[PDB]
A paper describes a structure:
Bacterial RNA helicase ρ is a genome sentinel that terminates the synthesis of damaged and junk RNAs that are not translated by the ribosome. The N-terminal domain (NTD) contains a primary RNA-binding site (PBS), the C-terminal domain (CTD) harbors a secondary RNA-binding site (SBS) and ATPase and helicase modules. Our results demonstrate that ADP and (p)ppGpp nucleotides bound at subunit interfaces inhibit ρ ring closure that underpins the hexamer activation, thus favoring the assembly of inactive higher-order oligomers. Here, we show that stress-associated nucleotides ADP and (p)ppGpp bind to the nucleotide-binding site in the CTD to trigger the formation of inactive ρ aggregates.
To test whether ρ forms filaments as revealed by the structures, we designed “sensor” Cys residues that would be closely spaced in filaments and used bismaleimidoethane (BMOE), a high-efficiency short-length (8.0 Å) cell-permeable sulfhydryl-to-sulfhydryl crosslinker, to assess filament formation. By contrast, (p)ppGpp induces the formation of transient ρ dodecamers. Our crosslinking shows that ADP, but not (p)ppGpp, promotes the formation of extended ρ filaments and our structures suggest that ADP-filaments may be more stable than ppGpp-induced dodecamers. Indeed, we observed that ppGpp-induced crosslinking of S84C ρ is incompatible with the filament structure. To corroborate this idea, we obtained a structure of ρX1 that was BMOE-crosslinked in the presence of ppGpp. Our results demonstrate that, in the presence of (p)ppGpp, the majority of ρ forms transient “non-extendable” dodecamers that cannot give rise to filaments and co-exist with a minor fraction of the filament-competent state. The alternative C-to-N filament and N-to-N constellations might explain the two bands representing dodecamers observed after BMOE crosslinking. Residue substitutions in the linker that connects ρ domains or binding of stress-associated nucleotides to the nearby ATPase site trigger the formation of dodecamers and higher-order polymers. ρ hexamers can form dynamic N-to-N dimers and long C-to-N filaments, which can be visualized by crosslinking in the presence of (p)ppGpp and ADP, respectively. Formation of stable (for cryoEM analyses) N-to-N dimers required prior crosslinking, and long ρ filaments could be directly observed on EM grids only if additionally stabilized by the C-terminal H8 extension and linker substitutions.
Author numbering:
A (entry chain K), B (entry chain J): 1 to 418
Write the structure that this text describes.
Amino acid sequence: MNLTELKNTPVSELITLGENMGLENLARMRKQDIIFAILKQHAKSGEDIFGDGVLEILQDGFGFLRSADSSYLAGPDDIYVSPCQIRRFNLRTGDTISGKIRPPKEGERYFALLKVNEVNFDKPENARNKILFENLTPLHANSRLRMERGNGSTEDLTARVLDLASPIGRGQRGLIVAPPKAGKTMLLQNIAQSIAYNHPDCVLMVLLIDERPEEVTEMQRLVKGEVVASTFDEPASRHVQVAEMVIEKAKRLVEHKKDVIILLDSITRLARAYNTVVPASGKVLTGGVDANALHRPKRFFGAARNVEEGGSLTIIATALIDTGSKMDEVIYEEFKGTGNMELHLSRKIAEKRVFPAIDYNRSGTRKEELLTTQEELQKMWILRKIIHPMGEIDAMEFLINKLACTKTNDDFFEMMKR
Amino acid sequence: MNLTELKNTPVSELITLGENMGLENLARMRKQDIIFAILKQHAKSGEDIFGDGVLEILQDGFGFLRSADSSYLAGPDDIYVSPCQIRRFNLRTGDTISGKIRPPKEGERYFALLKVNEVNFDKPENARNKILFENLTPLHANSRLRMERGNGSTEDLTARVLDLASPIGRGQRGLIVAPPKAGKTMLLQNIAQSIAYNHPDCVLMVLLIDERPEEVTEMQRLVKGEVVASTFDEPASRHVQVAEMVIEKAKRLVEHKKDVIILLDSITRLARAYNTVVPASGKVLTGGVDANALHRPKRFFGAARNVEEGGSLTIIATALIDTGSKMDEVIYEEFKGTGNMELHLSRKIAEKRVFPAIDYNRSGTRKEELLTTQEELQKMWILRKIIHPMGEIDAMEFLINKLACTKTNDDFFEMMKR
Ligand SMILES: O=C1C=CC(=O)N1CCN1C(=O)C=CC1=O
Ligand SMILES: [Mg+2]
C-alpha cells in the first residue's frame, strides 16, 4: 500500500507480513530483497501501492527513485522512471517524486512510477515554474540561527559557547577544524539537537562519510531529521554518490524557498574519496593529492549560500587536521580561506576532560554584524578583549564556569558587565 | 566411523586404520588422500558414515564442506553438496553442516551429503528463521570482556595491563599497532588464553595470515579453540580464501545469538594479499597499493559489531608498522581512524626487555564508559593523569612493578588510591 511505510518497518515485522501471503525463506535475504518480494505480493492482488524517493538521473537518461532510508543505496526495490517521464515534467537529480507504483512487466526488473503526484512537496506543473539554483544571486548571511536551547542544561552549555564563539546564520558556509580525539562527533550531535529544536521549520540533513557502522546508528537514533551516511567499508564510489545525491536534493529545496541545513562529517574524508574516484590529471600535488580532484569537493563546499530571492543553504563541514597524514594536511590547506566561518578545537583541552574543546582565540566568522544586533556584538567584543590575553586551555575553564551560573547568554552578558 | 574424528586422528594411526582393511602403501601420500582412501574402505562395506564441515559455495552453484582441521584446504575428502540441496534448506557460505555422507557413485569423484542433520548446531528447518547479518542493527560495545585472569601468575600481568590500558568489550573492533620484534605473538597467545578461560561460551577463532609454518603449530597447541592459518608459502589466493571463510563462518554464528571472537594476525598481511589478488582498477596509490584493493579487507575489518538483537563479533587485528616497507605504512594509514580501540606496542620498551611492551600513552579505547563501571572509570582516569607526563619506557616499567605487588587490578587501585 505504502512503500515508504514498508521500508521503515523493522525486518522482523517484514517476515511476518511476508508469511501472510505465503512467502517462505525470506529471513535469509537482504532487507531490500524482502521489500521487493513483498511488493510482488500486492502486485498479484492488484491493490494500489504508493511510494516515493529521491530521483537519481543516470548518464543514459533513465533514472531511479533512491530511498533516503537506505542511504540512497542502489537496491532492487528502487522505483524506475522512464526517460520519457522526466521530459513531460521537468525533473533532474534530487527531485522528490511521490506517486503510485506499477508492478514491473516482463523484462522489467524494477518497479515503475505510473503517475507523478507531488514533486518536492508540490504539484508537477508548479515545480516547472521554479528558477534554477545556480541562476540565483547569493547574499550574505543575515538571519541568526539561535543555537541555544534555553533550558540551561549541561548539553546546552556547549551551544552557548558556540553562539559566543562564532555566530552561525542561514546560508553561512561554516567549517570546523577538528584534531583527532577532540569530541568532534559529540559537538555535531549537539548542533543537530539544537537546530531541530529551536528551528523545526528548516530541513536538517546529516551526511557522514567514512564513518564507523556503530556511529551511524547512534546518529540515526539521536538526530531528529534525515540522517544519511556511508560506512568506511563501502567503496570510494559510494562515498561520492551518497554525497552528490545529498547536495542535489538540498538544492531543490532551495529552489522551492526552504531553509536547508547540512551537517557534514567530514570534508577531509569526502575529498580523499574524490581523489580516488576521478582519473589522474597528470599534474599531481604533494602527498599524492590530485590538484584537479580538489575541484569537485570545492563545488560541494561552494554551494552553500543565502539566496536573496528566498531560502538559504547551510553547510557545516568538519576538517580533520593533525591526523598524522600528509594528504589530510593538503586537503585542509585548500579549504583554508574558503570557509565563511571557522571553529577550532584544541586537543590539549580535550586531554583536560573539558568540553566543549573550543579554541575561542582562533575561531569566528566575518560579517558577524549582519547576524547579531548592535548591542550583542559590542558585548561579545568585550569578551574578545578578555579571552585574547588569556591562554587557550584556561580560557575555556574560565568561560565554562561563568556560563554555568547563568542560564542564558544575555544573563551572562549582565554578569561580566558588572 | 566419524569423518571429523578421522581428521583429528594423527596420520600414524591412520596408517594403522588403513592397514586393518588391507590398504597398501598409504604412508607415501598426503593425509587428505589417506582419509579419502580410508573412507572408500567403508564405502564398499556399506556401513553408515558420519561427518561435518563448513560450506563454500562456488559461483557455479555447488559447494563443499571444508574442514577447519585442514585450514579449509581444498582437500579431496571435501563433501559435495548439490545445487538443489542448498535450495531445499536456505544455505549459504559459512554454514556449518553435519550429516551422513553417501559414497561417490560412478562419474563422481567427491563424497556427497545425503541427509542434512544439523545446520549451525541447530535443526535444518529452524536455520531459515534467522535474520541475515547485515540486516541486523549494529551498536556500541557495552559488555566488557574480563581479560584479567585473577590468579596472580607471571603471564597475568600481560592481561592485567591490557584491561587497564584499553578495555575491550564484545563486538569491539580493535586494532593492535605492532612494530616488528615487539613481542606481538606473545601478546596474542596471552589474550587467547584469558578469553578461553574467562569466557568459555564465546566462539574463539584465531586466524593467522602469511605466518611461518613454525608459529602455526605453536598456536594450535596453546589456543583452546579454532586456530586456522595460512603459511607464507601458500599463494596469495589462499590468504583471502582462508580469510573470507572465517568471517563468513563468524557471521553465521552471530545470527544464532552467539558471541564470536576473531584474533587476526595480521591485517597488514591480509591487505597485501588482497592487493595481489584483485585486478588493477587504473588508480594506484603511493607505495604500490591499489586504491580499490583496500575495499575488500575493510569489509572484513568492518564486520565487527555488537548486534542489538543478540550476540556480537569481536575482531582484534594486528597492524604492522615500522617494517621499512612503504606498502605496510600505507595500509596502516587507511585503517588509522577505523578501529573502535587501539593498542600501541612500542619497540623501545621491547628492547629494554620489559614485557608486555605497551605504549600506555598512545593506547586507549572509545566509549569506555559503556564497558567499565562508573567508579572503575574514575580510577582509570586517575591513573592516566599519573602516566601522562611519564615517558613510554619508564611508565610501563613503573606500571609493571606496581601491578606485581597486588593480586588483582581493583586491589592495585586501593594501593595507588592513597
Ligand atoms: O540439476 C540439479 C541441481 C541440483 C541437483 O541435484 N540437480 C539434479 C541432479 N540429479 C539428477 O539429474 C538426477 C538425480 C540427481 O540428483
Ligand atoms: Mg604496546
